[PDB]
């Protein structure tokens, strides 16, 4: 589990997980 994992998956999955991630604020930034 490292940043390259997210850049290894295709855009379809990239935006899918990004949405869930932003919505769940697991480590999101409000700066």
């Amino acid at each position: 589990m490292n940043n390259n994992e997210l850049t290894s998956l295709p855009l379809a999955e990239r935006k899918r997980l990004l949405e869930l991630a932003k919505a769940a604020k697991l480590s999101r930034q409000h700066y």
């Binding site: 589990m1 490292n2 940043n3 994992e5 997210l6 850049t7 998956l9 855009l11 999955e13 990239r14 935006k15 899918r16 997980l17 990004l18 869930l20 991630a21 932003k22 769940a24 697991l26 480590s27 999101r28 930034q29 700066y31």
Partner: protein
């Protein structure tokens, strides 16, 4: 008084993710509008404008984008693909894998 190329079907920017970059583009090239299929090179953008643009992407989206991506995706619709991956990079990669494996 003749500049740019002839339009026939202008394509409006998409919501807040796409319009966000599109708004800045005409200000940089001093253009009219930005269409989702218009190429920065046809519109009036040149390498030096891509350098400053990257610097804006960095502060606008709070990420670290490289100039090569901008030239590789010379239009609004293509550019969003880079924001998607760059945005995820600010989130934690450990917790990300837990959400990722649970996605549809």
């Amino acid at each position: 008084d003749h500049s740019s190329v002839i339009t026939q079907e202008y394509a409006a920017p998409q919501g807040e993710i796409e319009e966000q970059l599109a708004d800045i583009w005409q200000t940089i090239l001093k253009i009219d509008r930005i269409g989702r299929y218009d190429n920065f090179f046809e519109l009036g953008g040149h390498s030096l404008l891509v350098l400053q643009l990257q610097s804006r992407i960095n502060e606008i989206f709070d990420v670290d984008i490289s100039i090569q991506q901008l030239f590789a995706h010379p239009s609004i619709c293509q550019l969003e693909e880079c924001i998607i991956n760059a945005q995820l990079l600010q989130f934690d990669a450990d917790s990300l894998q837990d959400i990722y494996k649970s996605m549809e």
